[PDB]
Amino acid sequence: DIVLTQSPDSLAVSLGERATINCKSSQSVLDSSNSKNYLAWYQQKPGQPPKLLIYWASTRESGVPDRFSGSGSGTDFTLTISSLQAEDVAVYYCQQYYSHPYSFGQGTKLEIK
Amino acid sequence: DIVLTQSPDSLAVSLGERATINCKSSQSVLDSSNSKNYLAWYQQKPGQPPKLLIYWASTRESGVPDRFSGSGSGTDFTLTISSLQAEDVAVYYCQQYYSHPYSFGQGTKLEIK
User: Fold this and answer.
1) Which pairs of Cys residues are joined through disulfide bonds in the record (chains A, B)?
2) N or C: which end of chain B has fewer CB within 10 A?
């Protein structure tokens, strides 16, 4: 089964600065036929459900701020927040839906420094 | 935007008994062209990422105990946990992926009486 490992586990970034979170999959999640990477990114704040930010590794979800972007292919992916805002403090998770059982990374805590 | 509302918000159940969690969608998530309900259920414990339990409303993910079962259709769904065990203490979420933006219910916290 595919295992996702995120890094770092926690990130402290100054307000307005760029935040970068990585996710590495044990197996490629790139579908060679359609060229799609079955990888998604979620944001989750205390007492609230997860919120989808990016899917297909780099397509932005409806309603999600433009400062959120995803990149990468195969086994290495990255979530980038162009300009960190106070409201971006939360836990971020990557998820693969390439093959069952689907799985999530351990999560990365993002805080203001 | 399809909104999911779970009920109850929290519940306390006794070991060995049956727990029931409902999810209501503001609009139907049943695709009449293929007869599939684009609805999933997740389990999440403190400090851990979400874990997929059921998808397509009633298909149980591999590795998941058979005490977990999903039912329902259209706008009304139910997650049933039979023979409750201490390890089932967690927050449960329903998720719809019928139309964008995809969305999660507010979550239901399950505890042991």
Assistant:
1) 23-94
2) C
Resolution, angstroms, 1 dp: 1.5
> Chain B contacts of A52, Cβ < 8 Å?
101-102
Beta strand ranges found along A1-113 (DSSP E): 4-7, 10-13, 19-25, 30-31, 36-37, 39-44, 51-55, 59-60, 68-73, 76-81, 90-96, 103-104, 108-112
**Method of determination used here:** X-ray
The domain of B85 spans: 1-113
Q: Exposed, middle or buried: residue A70 (CB in 10 Å: 0-12, 13-18, 19+)?
A: buried
CA distance B32 to chain A (A): 24
CATH number (domain holding residue A34): 2.60.40.10
Closest partner residue to B104 (CB to CB) among A50, A104, A106 is: A50
Residues of chain A positioned with their CB less than 8 A from the CB of B1:
63
